[PDB]
């Protein structure tokens, strides 16, 4: 089930920067994945927090905007990873720009979008064990 992965992930990316907040298999290669995916594209992610500009009055709207565009023409795993890392970006500039309540808010959003927009694709395409298989190393 979906609300769990978001937590351990968000909690992982927040923890691995200095901040503390609020079977077990997929998680771990979803962390090795995010981490490799972010280093994979460090120079591309730098340009991202520089266009983020997060205020709570805009947070919902900022998140919606991106997520809908990212998955507009379809889903694949790479996109799904990119989604998790983006949640991680928001959750961090929240804590940085002193908005840690958002971190709770962003978590619910990520979860509402997994369950109400991405679940079907993951089921119709092998579940998360499918993913682990593919990421492996």
């Amino acid at each position: 089930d979906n609300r769990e992965i978001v937590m351990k992930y968000i909690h992982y990316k927040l923890s691995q920067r200095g901040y503390e907040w609020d079977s077990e298999v997929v998680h771990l290669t979803l962390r090795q994945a995010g981490d490799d995916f972010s280093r994979r594209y460090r120079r591309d992610f730098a340009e991202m927090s520089s266009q983020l500009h997060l205020t709570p009055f805009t947070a919902r709207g900022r998140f919606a905007t991106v997520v809908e565009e990212l998955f507009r023409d379809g889903v694949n795993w790479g996109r799904i990873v990119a989604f998790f890392e983006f949640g991680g970006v928001m959750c961090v500039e929240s804590v940085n720009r002193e908005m840690s309540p958002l971190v709770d808010n962003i978590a619910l959003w990520m979860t509402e979008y997994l369950n109400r927009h991405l679940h079907t694709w993951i089921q119709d395409n092998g579940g998360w064990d499918a993913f682990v298989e593919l990421y492996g190393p």
């Binding site: 995916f37 994979r40 594209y41 591309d44 340009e47 991202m48 266009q51 983020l52 905007t65 991106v66 997520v67 809908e68 565009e69 990212l70 694949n76 795993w77 790479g78 996109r79 799904i80 990873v81 990119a82 989604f83 983006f86 593919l134 990421y135």
Partner: peptide, 19 residues
Amino acid sequence: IXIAQXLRXIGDXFNXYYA
């Protein structure tokens, strides 16, 4: 929509480079 299209691109490149 910047920011999202160019996550998309790298997402899709990743999903390539892992095909």
